[PDB]
Amino acid sequence: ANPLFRKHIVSINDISRNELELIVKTAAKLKEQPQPELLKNKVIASCFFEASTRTRLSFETAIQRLGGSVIGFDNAGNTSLAKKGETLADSISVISSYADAFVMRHPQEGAARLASEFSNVPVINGGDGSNQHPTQTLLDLFSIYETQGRLDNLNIAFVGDLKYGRTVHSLAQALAKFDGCKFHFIAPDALAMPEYICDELDEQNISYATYASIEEVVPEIDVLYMTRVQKERFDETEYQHMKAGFILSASSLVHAKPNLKVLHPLPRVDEIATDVDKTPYAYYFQQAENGVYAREALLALVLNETIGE
Amino acid sequence: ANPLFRKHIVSINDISRNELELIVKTAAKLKEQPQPELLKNKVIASCFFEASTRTRLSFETAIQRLGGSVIGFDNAGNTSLAKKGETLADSISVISSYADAFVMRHPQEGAARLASEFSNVPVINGGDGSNQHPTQTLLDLFSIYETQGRLDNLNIAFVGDLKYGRTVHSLAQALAKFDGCKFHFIAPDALAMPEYICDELDEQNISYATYASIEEVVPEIDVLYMTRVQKERFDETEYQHMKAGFILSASSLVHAKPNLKVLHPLPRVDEIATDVDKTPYAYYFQQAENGVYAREALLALVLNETIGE
Amino acid sequence: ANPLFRKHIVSINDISRNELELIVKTAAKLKEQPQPELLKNKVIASCFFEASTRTRLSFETAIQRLGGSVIGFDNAGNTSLAKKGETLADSISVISSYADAFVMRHPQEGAARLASEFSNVPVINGGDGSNQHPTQTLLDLFSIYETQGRLDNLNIAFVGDLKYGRTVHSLAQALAKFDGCKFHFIAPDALAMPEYICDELDEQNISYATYASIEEVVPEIDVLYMTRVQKERFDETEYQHMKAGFILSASSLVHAKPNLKVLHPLPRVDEIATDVDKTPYAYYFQQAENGVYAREALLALVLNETIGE
Amino acid sequence: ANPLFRKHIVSINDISRNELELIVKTAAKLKEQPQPELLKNKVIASCFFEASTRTRLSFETAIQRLGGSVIGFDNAGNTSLAKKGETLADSISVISSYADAFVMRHPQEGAARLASEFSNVPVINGGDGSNQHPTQTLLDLFSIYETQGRLDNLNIAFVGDLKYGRTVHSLAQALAKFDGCKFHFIAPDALAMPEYICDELDEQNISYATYASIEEVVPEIDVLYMTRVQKERFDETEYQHMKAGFILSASSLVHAKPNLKVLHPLPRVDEIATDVDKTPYAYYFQQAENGVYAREALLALVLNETIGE
Amino acid sequence: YVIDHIPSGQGVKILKLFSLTDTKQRVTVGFNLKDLIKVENTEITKSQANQLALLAPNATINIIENFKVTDKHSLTLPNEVENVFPCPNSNCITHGEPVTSSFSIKNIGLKCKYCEKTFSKDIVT
Amino acid sequence: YVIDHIPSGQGVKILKLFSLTDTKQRVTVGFNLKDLIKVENTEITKSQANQLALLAPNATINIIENFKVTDKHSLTLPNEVENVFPCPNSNCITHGEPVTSSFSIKNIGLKCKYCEKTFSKDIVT
Ligand SMILES: [Zn+2]
Numbered sequence A, B, C, D: 001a002n003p004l005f006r007k008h009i010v011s012i013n014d015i016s017r018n019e020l021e022l023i024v025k026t027a028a029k030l031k032e033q034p035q036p037e038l039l040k041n042k043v044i045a046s047c048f049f050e051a052s053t054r055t056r057l058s059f060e061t062a063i064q065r066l067g068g069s070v071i072g073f074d075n076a077g078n079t080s081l082a083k084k085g086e087t088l089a090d091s092i093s094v095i096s097s098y099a100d101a102f103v104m105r106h107p108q109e110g111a112a113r114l115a116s117e118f119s120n121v122p123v124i125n126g127g128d129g130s131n132q133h134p135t136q137t138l139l140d141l142f143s144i145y146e147t148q149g150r151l152d153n154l155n156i157a158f159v160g161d162l163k164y165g166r167t168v169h170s171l172a173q174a175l176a177k178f179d180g181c182k183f184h185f186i187a188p189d190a191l192a193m194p195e196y197i198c199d200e201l202d203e204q205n206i207s208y209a210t211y212a213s214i215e216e217v218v219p220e221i222d223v224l225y226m227t228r229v230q231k232e233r234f235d236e237t238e239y240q241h242m243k244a245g246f247i248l249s250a251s252s253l254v255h256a257k258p259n260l261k262v263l264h265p266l267p268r269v270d271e272i273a274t275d276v277d278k279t280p281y282a283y284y285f286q287q288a289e290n291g292v293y294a295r296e297a298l299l300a301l302v303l304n305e306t307i308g309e
Numbered sequence E, F: 001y002v003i004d005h006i007p008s009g010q011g012v013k014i015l016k017l018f019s020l021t022d023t024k025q026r027v028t029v030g031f032n033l034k035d036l037i038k039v040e041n042t043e044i045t046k047s048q049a050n051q052l053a054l055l056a057p058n059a060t061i062n063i064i065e066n067f068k069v070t071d072k073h074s075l076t077l078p079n080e081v082e083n084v085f086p087c088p089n090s091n092c093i094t095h096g097e098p099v100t101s102s103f104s105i106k107n108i109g110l111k112c113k114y115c116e117k118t119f120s121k122d123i124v125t
């Protein structure tokens, strides 16, 4: 058995360096040589209590890509589930019992862990409030690996909302289980990387620094992970001032090295200008596409004792 | 390789007579001698930004009938997509990635054209606002072909709202790419066939004429196309007065040619009377079903160089 | 007693020339010398089953202007009235019995007439679907009188949607009970003044004509009643072509006579350009303001045997 | 004639020290020796585009307490107004016509200024987005005055969200037009008083300082102003951690000056504990009530040259 | 090159809508005399010249190479109008979106590449 | 009059935003040499001259009366900016509405007459 066979996928915290590496290596393998019957005669629950189109379709494609079927829902709007009095626990007990694996997304944190204690079948946390979204981080790791040929010894920059951006936190956390990545944090003072993430980085012996601008670090960077600067944590006057510093244009990448790739977990709105799309560094759309293969590999490894590739 | 291979299907105006014939012929084989593996291991994206059940179930049935998988959604309100700043372009670019073809319906005119420019995979226009609905015309022509044994030299009555009836505009335009059809128009004075459609027909050496009643022309007609004469288009006193002479009943059909098929694109409320259903001419439900086989044909030709028997 | 004392005000059809004249003359009198205790210790129901802010506030101001009080509601959204099973008849019976007069607005035609058969207290039709809105016509007559010193022998133009525009119909109908107004109809072919209005005008010996443009008739016109050209009765392509002809700018009034007044029942959107506001001919805002005095006078005349002005 | 006669009330920044004193003095007479005919035969428009019950009932009470009538609405969703193309300007211009003064609250910043330019009748700003809420500051100052017997040389603590607390920004600014106030600021590091407000205070020779706790400063404080420390402004772990030290309890007040009045603009959830209510310092409910008398004062001075006793 | 016979008031619109003031190369303009434009050291096809025809219907386009005229292009209506005018159709997908406006030129009408509706040449301006 | 020392690329913006090409009077413009504008038979105050200062920070404004210079206005930042720039605040009432944009000029900041928010001189452009 591979280390993930029959395991629940709840948090990036409980996935080791070795497991991450195997997941990305498996994504790469599956993308090169699809295995369209791996999940033959397997039925996969895909229960999105909270809408996530890009994620949901990403998963549903992966399942069906491997020969599996899909049951479930896409927003708890339509569902009659967990209405007035009924526990999520009960709901999961019933629906997981229909199926061979249980992909869920939920607005309450801890909801994938609870699921895993009431499903007799492996559960994949498609997202649980502000807590975890492992497959996003996994698709982000894969895309790095795909374009840098490794995950150790990389110069990664993170831009935008680093205080509340959960996708950067888990990614920094994942990469920090590998060797000698130096992180570069470019964000408003008011959205600096949080104190506790930084301690974890010290404890994982991993250099980080703060920079004022994107353009500053571009020539010494391999991966530029862009996130959105949301106006909620500011007002109008603040945003309109603080936004300008953290928008990525074609002009910003003029001194990029060739292997530079621009990532964004999407959606973008104006934090990456249109004119970056055609530049050789843009990889956000490929990143989105790599969501399918990342989720293929996880589903595969979870349900198949071996990948007889 | 057939001319539609790897082509986008956006507009009836970009489909030629040969192509239209190829589609109805393919639709006939797939209906009569089905080929449930023609899209084995193909994943088809079905994205209905604007809700259209009849159409969506049709496509989704066609996809799976051919061995394909479906991903996508049924309206945009149930989605997390195209939110606030988020372009349609970005959304297409991502969901495209997931699929081998992209079927879409959208409230806005041109959305299928835009889609075709941001998708590396062939898009099928499921309907873009008031502009195009090609597969509707394709199922309409298939039904005519199937029941008449030809598309050339048919007598066709178009009845109801000819002015804003985008379905008749295309069907008229399409059959105008053929020989010898003579068109008969029955509408209120306020809902005549557009001047611009008539110029086309004149450019294409095709007989049309207007008539006061449906009964008047029945002895001469091979196909009777009923559209929906909506309440919006006048006030009450007007609708009540005008509706009478544009409703089809079984008695209307007392002098029908034995090959006469009544069509209606659906839905239908009072415009075709219930007693027509039992008659040998009612073909609107068969026509609706032919939506599956027209959309199969199109998906098939789009993705397979050649198609066998 | 004045002719209107204790009468129901349902339709402009049942208000004679003499009654119209007295209403406008009374408006003028009340506007010059308010009578703030005419409706002292009178409670007036103002029940808007269908929202009409400009109308509702216009009425409520008038009531209170005369020393009266107001009870009621502004949309049937909030009300618990006429819910599942309960008749409007019952509702009116109860609420009118609270009050000394009953101002209502409703989305179903005939609703003010029904009200008047279940209220023991006079009812004022604030609007009943596409049927009547007498106080609008009355405020329109007043504004004409105020600015032309009479209602006979006037050259009035009507612009925009004359087919479905109920405000022009009742106004034309009201003015037609007076002597020797010549009407000028400027509207799209597709929204000509209706056949039946025109017959009524013939029967009231009243000259009308059709003109292509606003600008054509301006120098021979005293009142230019503008209405909105709504896009519903067209599509996008139609509207965008047909709108241009029926927009009133400052440039259009260059050859106006001095006594020219531009009326619009409001809201305007772009059928009267901003730049008309400052011109000496604009009277739509004054027209809106004159809604208060028109409704003051009606309420007064309905409830007071005499106006001891 | 008093300086506010026939003036627009849009911004606390346009009200001088004398004017502020005049308002609180007038508010005191109208509270203590009322004058229920000061707006006899005046009609006051109360238009709440954005719903604000506490504020609207306050104004509406003030209006009628003075002998005035009310017209208007409680939100825009219940309205037929400012629909689609319809300007706010047009809407003001019409409703203005109806009234002798126009009170308005609106979601957009500047809406009261715009209103003042399209109304021939004095507008009172009931709140325009994040910009101004003058009558809130006016009831705040009145309450301070009334309880303290002065507005000069008071010790004032401002507690909670100082950064986005538009109510404190104005109250601070206003009391800064007076002498010798010393301000004490208690907030999280992330919710400090804006740099720009501090410059003002420096320009105006006024002492401020920050403190870690409420208790720390209670012995020295005459007025304690609590704002609401909202959940939006951090994530969960942050809120939970920070909330503790910004909640007021009765025990907090063990060393209060006997003249200490606790204020809060309302609503209040956990930020002031229930046991404070019974204490001799709780004045938030009296302060809310003082909304009536501040808004009376303002309406009175706006419409009457002079006001007697 | 130098563009002559431009209507006075529509000539300013050319500079804006065609971003003629964008290169390092010198550019000169005179309004009212008719407007006029001169463009130092830049090339232009007889193809691209026609894009302008929409705004100045009857306008001479001369070319300087060597301090004097060499060729004199006169304009016709071209087949296409790539991103010059927005589509008058409010519902059109073109509007919020990262695409270039485009009309085929057909009674002189303009037909949206995207929504496929058809507008009179004037309504587009 | 004639306006000198204008930055190349911001000079086109003056013609547009200030509608200088509007009168019958002749108007001439040269881009890149710096942009430059000449305006035949029209008057302008030292007041109105300053509106321009926002776009061309250090720009000479000379005046022709009689084929040669008479006065040479040099620009300062004025108190006001009546309808030149839209307000960067998306929520601002100014946007859909029949009013003229307006900012007071205050560290060189611009303060909306309407929403009363305050923006850095650059963010407005
Ligand atoms: Zn278009």
Ligand SMILES: [Zn+2]
Pocket (backbone or CB within 6 Å): D110, F087, F088, F089, F092, F093, F094, F112, F113, F114, F115, F116, F117
């Ligand atoms: Zn603003």
